[PDB]
């Protein structure tokens, strides 16, 4: 994921986080992804293009 | 203030014992209670007290309910020969009569 | 998950559901408990950070312990914070491995071992005495805090013989707990972190600024070679929407 | 307070029952105040019971002015059913000013409701009682006319006053400069008020507590307590 | 005074107070010092070491600062250290000795006997002779599970050492409180100097946090709050003041006039010796209200008089001093009720100043402004109001 030039910071998580709200098993992985500022992405390449 | 009192009377110990035995779980559990402005724990010889203080204007009985909401998760975790008593429904001004 | 009708008060529902929680405590196994949920919703997740080490000095276990027993007990001091939840890292466990050949050589089961272990990690009461008028209470030791202390434990006695020590049958060490939740940055490496919740129906910007300045002032006392790295914050989206709406109104 | 206002009225009007007005106008206001508290609790503490003693003195002025003007206009008409109608006219010619003044002296107590705290919530009930009593008395003064219609010396006062008024009017700027001098000299007590703010409430009972060290036995404590009680 | 002078026993510092106040103070589990520094840490040694420096670090900054670290280190504990090796040498676990420590020496409870509704505890302990002195404890007979008759000193060593008497925990963490306080001054700027000093010159240990608190904090809000509302309230006066005159000049005149009665009222506390407070503020509010009443009412009479016959002559050519006669006939109709009000107020409020019943010093504090201002507000109205009125064009 980080190979893409537009992503700035990633954070992967698997399982729960010692809280009652989360119930993710050891296989469900949730990856938060922060994108670079719109002015700095690339020529064009809207959000749909990124996804 | 509007606050709740929790007491636990052990016959005889040292303040460190009750501190690391009875006060630590109560405080660590009540730290996550709603409306908590600040928790305080006094460890004394034999007996230990806990004062929970909330914001002003809140309902006292609502605070009692919310603080009891986290009191059952520590009963079994507490030693057998002890218990956790709650405070009355009054303030320091409650002392009205006194006789001998 | 207990679901009620709409429009009802959340705290009233909490009270009513706790009304039937005490009738099952004693009915529940001993080595377990029943914890309740926080005072927030899925939207409560507001902030998210990770503890990175730009070196190979500290281990994941140290970072996990720091995040569990130093920061968690400080961020929650903020009034409007629902709760903070740790994630990732390693839970240092004092694990004791056994050797069945030794158990056979000495012929001892495991229940006796459990009993011995449950009778060697506590102190006694110290009711005082009436010595000289400067009163003088008592206190005993008995807390297990050293591996050398773990090695000096009795399992069965042999009058006029030699008592069997734990070191002769087993081996103690420190290791990782059975992991159920892991976290990681980009391919840099594994890390531990925390997530912040928000009380249902409260301002965000305030608590975000509070936690931000708190981490700023706390970075000083932080150990060497450790850094905080944020990953999620609603404040950006909030201010972006505010600016967009203000510009639309102005035009 | 009631008896002194009554004797003052009887002195300045030579045995007129106008005093009754006060006695049937100031107490009723109190009632209204209490009624309000019943709709929101606010048990009567000592501060609330104290503030009314000053509220009554702050409120009596409206009734005083009303009865004075009414008697004045009546004595004026003496120089020459509808009589009481023109009395009511002479009362309403000044009514609205008194109503607005009572409303403003009522609403001037919000800064007390603003602050909140141990002392803030101690004082709150006082200001609440104050404002409610002022509003009640405003209403009563608006309806104090029926009880009103139901029922030598000042020459010296005017003789002493009028020459002073004639003397001062020719020098107004001097009065303004005197006011400036007053608002200047006021600064001296302001900077040296002292201290010991929020005094303590005295009581016929007392409680003694000595600061002492922790170490103490079960018999030494009893012996010391008995010795102190005997002393 | 006679009591404090009579009772004097060594080791005590007397205090005499009201019972209810003492109770509600006892119950207040907060910091009473105007300034307080809370240092939180994972252990006691680190926080104590930090506070040791913080003491003199705060003592250095200007402003009287009674730097008190703590007063809890006054306990007295036995330290019976269980040599686990020696206990194992006789086939005894820790608990096997902890039991003797609890019951044979302490006298733990074992159960309650019933006598109807009354439950009475049951104790179990050794005699009082074997548990009198530490030397007597070093010879405490013990019977091992294998029936080996030994003493306590054969498995453990007892030592003497002091310690705490009570422990405070804020947020489930060891915390030490340092009290600092000045008097007759607002400590609004010293806090910044103190925090910057402790941050620049005093290092922090990993696992230690510092925070400030005290009365000062709440003040920073209270003042602010009133500093936000008092203006608006004053505006609520303006809008409500000219409703009887429909012109701004009159309301502005009354607003600039009330401070005269304010000064008249405040000048009394010097003679009486009292000190301002919130209640004195409420008294000031009431005095200002009555002064505004006087001013409004006199202004109504002046406006009714100027609208008389001279209303046609004064605009004719110029002043025509004769117009002052109007004011004459405009003022004679006001001295009587004003004097009546002043007399009744003074004669009703005097005994409260000169009386002591139940909660009377307070009532005197609240009544002083009225008695002090009722000597100027009447003069104010009678004299300065018509002057400014004639000076209003
Ligand atoms: Cu006390």
UniProtKB/Swiss-Prot annotation, chain D:
The chain crosses the membrane at residues 1-14, 19-39, 47-67, 94-114, 133-151, 168-188. The cus efflux system is composed of CusA, CusB, CusC and CusF. One of its GO terms (molecular function) is copper ion binding. The gene is cusA. It is found in: Cell inner membrane. The keyword Ion transport applies. It comes from Escherichia coli (strain K12). The chain holds residues 345 to 595 of 1047 of the full protein. Changing residue 61 to N: Loss of copper resistance. Changing residue 209 to I: Loss of copper resistance. This is Cation efflux system protein CusA. Induction: Transcriptionally regulated by CusR in response to copper and silver ions.
Curated annotation (Swiss-Prot), chain E:
Induction: Transcriptionally regulated by CusR in response to copper and silver ions. It comes from the Bacteria. One of its GO terms (molecular function) is copper ion transmembrane transporter activity. The chain crosses the membrane at residues 225-245, 252-272, 282-302, 339-359, 366-386. One of its GO terms (biological process) is response to copper ion. Keywords: Cell inner membrane, Cell membrane, Copper, Copper transport, Ion transport, Membrane, Transmembrane, Transmembrane helix, Transport. One of its GO terms (cellular component) is membrane. Changing residue 166 to I: Slight decrease in copper resistance. Changing residue 26 to I: Loss of copper resistance. It is found in: Cell inner membrane. Signal peptide: none annotated. The cus system plays an important role in copper tolerance under anaerobic growth and, under extreme copper stress, in aerobic growth. Part of a cation efflux system that mediates resistance to copper and silver. Belongs to the resistance-nodulation-cell division (RND) (TC 2.A.6) family. The cus efflux system is composed of CusA, CusB, CusC and CusF. This is Cation efflux system protein CusA. It comes from Escherichia coli (strain K12). The chain holds residues 647 to 1039 of 1047 of the full protein.
């Amino acid at each position: 994921i980080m190979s893409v030039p537009e992503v700035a910071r990633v954070f992967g998580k698997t399982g729960k986080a010692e809280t009652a709200t989360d119930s993710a098993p050891l296989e469900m992985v949730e990856t938060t992804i922060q994108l670079k500022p719109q002015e700095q992405w690339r020529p064009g390449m809207t959000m749909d293009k990124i996804i | 203030d509007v606050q709740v009192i929790i007491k636990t009377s052990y016959p005889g110990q040292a303040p460190q014992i009750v501190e690391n035995q009875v006060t630590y779980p109560l405080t660590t559990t009540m730290l996550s209670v709603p409306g908590a402005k600040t928790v305080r724990g006094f460890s004394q010889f034999g007996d230990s007290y806990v004062y929970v203080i909330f914001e002003d204007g809140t309902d006292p009985y609502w605070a009692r309910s919310r603080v009891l909401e986290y009191l059952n998760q520590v009963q079994g975790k507490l030693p057998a020969g002890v218990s956790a008593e709650l405070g009355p429904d009054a303030t320091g001004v409650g002392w009205i009569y006194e006789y001998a | 998950y207990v679901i009620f009708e709409d429009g009802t008060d959340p705290y009233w529902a909490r009270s009513r559901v706790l009304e039937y929680l005490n009738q099952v405590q004693g009915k529940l196994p001993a080595g377990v408990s029943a914890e309740l949920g926080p005072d927030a919703t899925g939207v409560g997740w507001i902030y998210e950070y990770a503890l990175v080490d730009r070196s190979g000095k500290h281990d994941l276990a140290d970072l996990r312990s720091l995040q569990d027993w130093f920061l968690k007990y400080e961020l929650k001091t903020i009034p409007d914070v629902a709760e903070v939840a740790s994630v990732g890292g390693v839970v240092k466990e004092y694990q004791v491995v056994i050797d069945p050949q030794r158990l056979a050589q000495y012929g001892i089961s495991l229940a006796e071992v459990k009993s011995a272990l449950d009778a060697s990690n506590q102190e006694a009461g110290g009711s005082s005495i009436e010595l000289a008028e400067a009163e003088y209470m008592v206190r005993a030791s008995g807390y297990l805090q050293t591996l050398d202390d773990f090695n000096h434990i009795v399992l069965k006695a042999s009058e006029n013989g030699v008592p069997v020590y734990l070191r002769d049958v087993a081996k103690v060490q420190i290791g990782p707990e059975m992991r159920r939740g892991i976290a990681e940055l980009n391919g840099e490496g594994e890390v531990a972190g925390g997530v912040v919740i928000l009380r249902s129906g409260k301002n965000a910007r305030e608590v975000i600024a509070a936690v931000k300045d708190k981490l700023e002032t706390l970075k000083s006392s932080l150990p060497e070679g450790v850094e905080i790295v944020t990953t999620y914050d609603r404040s950006q989206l909030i201010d972006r929407a505010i600016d967009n709406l203000s510009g639309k109104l102005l035009e | 307070e009631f008896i002194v206002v009554a004797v003052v009225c009887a002195l300045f009007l030579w045995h007129v029952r106008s005093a009754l007005v006060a006695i049937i106008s100031l107490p009723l206001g109190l009632c209204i105040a209490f009624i309000v508290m019943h709709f929101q609790g606010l048990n009567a503490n000592i501060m609330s019971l104290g503030g009314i003693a000053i509220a009554v003195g702050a409120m009596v002025d409206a009734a005083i002015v009303m009865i004075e003007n009414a008697h004045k206009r009546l004595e004026e008409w003496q120089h020459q059913k509808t009589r009481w109608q023109v009395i009511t006219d002479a009362s309403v010619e000044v009514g609205p000013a008194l109503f607005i003044s009572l409303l403003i002296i009522t609403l001037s107590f919000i800064p007390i409701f603003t602050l909140e705290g141990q002392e803030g919530r101690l004082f709150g009930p006082l200001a609440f009682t104050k404002t409610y009593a002022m509003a009640g008395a405003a209403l009563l003064a608006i309806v104090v006319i029926p009880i009103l219609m139901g029922y030598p010396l000042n020459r010296f006062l005017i003789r002493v006053y009028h020459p002073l008024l004639l003397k001062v009017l020719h020098w107004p700027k001097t009065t303004l400069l005197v006011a400036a001098l007053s608002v200047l000299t006021v600064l001296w007590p302001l900077n040296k008020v002292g201290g010991e703010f929020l005094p303590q409430i005295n009581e016929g009972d007392l409680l003694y507590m000595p600061s002492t060290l922790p170490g103490i036995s079960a018999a030494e404590a009893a012996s010391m307590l008995q010795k102190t009680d005997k002393l | 005074e006679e009591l404090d002078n009579t009772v004097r026993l060594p080791g005590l510092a007397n205090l005499w107070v009201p019972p209810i106040r003492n109770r509600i103070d006892m119950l207040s589990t907060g910091i009473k010092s105007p300034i307080g520094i809370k240092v939180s840490g994972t252990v006691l040694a680190d926080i104590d070491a930090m506070a040791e420096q913080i003491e003199e670090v705060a003592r250095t900054v200007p402003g009287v600062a009674s730097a008190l670290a703590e007063r809890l280190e006054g306990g007295r504990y036995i330290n019976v250290e269980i040599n686990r090796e020696k206990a194992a040498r006789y086939g005894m676990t820790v608990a096997d000795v902890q039991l003797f420590v609890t019951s044979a020496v302490g006298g733990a409870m074992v159960g309650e006997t019933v006598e109807g509704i009354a439950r009475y505890p049951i104790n179990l302990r050794y005699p009082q002779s074997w548990r009198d002195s530490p030397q007597a404890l070093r010879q405490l007979p013990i019977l091992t599970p294998m029936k080996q008759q030994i003493t306590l000193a054969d498995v453990a060593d007892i030592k003497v050492s002091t310690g705490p008497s009570m422990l405070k925990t804020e947020n489930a963490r060891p915390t030490s409180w340092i009290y600092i306080d000045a008097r007759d001054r607002d400590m609004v700027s010293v806090v910044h100097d103190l925090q910057k000093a402790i941050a620049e010159k005093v290092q922090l240990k990993p696992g230690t946090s510092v925070a400030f608190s005290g009365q000062f904090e709440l003040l920073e809000r209270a003042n602010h709050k009133l500093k936000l509302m008092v203006p608006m309230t004053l505006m609520i006066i303006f809008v409500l003041l000219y409703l009887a005159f429909r012109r701004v000049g009159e309301a502005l005149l009354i607003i600039s006039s009330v401070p005269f009665a304010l000064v008249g009222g405040i000048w009394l506390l010097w003679w009486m010796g009292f000190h301002l407070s919130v209640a004195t503020g409420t008294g000031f509010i009431a005095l200002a209200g009555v002064a505004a009443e006087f001013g409004v009412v006199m202004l109504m009479y002046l406006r009714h008089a100027i609208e008389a016959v001279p209303s046609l002559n004064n605009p004719q050519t110029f002043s025509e001093q004769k117009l002052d006669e109007a004011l004459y006939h405009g003022a004679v109709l006001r001295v009587r009720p004003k004097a009546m009000t002043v007399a009744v107020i003074i004669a009703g409020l005097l005994p409260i100043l000169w009386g002591t019943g139940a909660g009377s010093e307070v009532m005197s504090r609240i009544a002083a402004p009225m008695i002090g201002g009722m000597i100027t507000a009447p003069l104010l109205s009678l004299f300065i109001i018509p002057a400014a009125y004639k000076l209003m064009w």
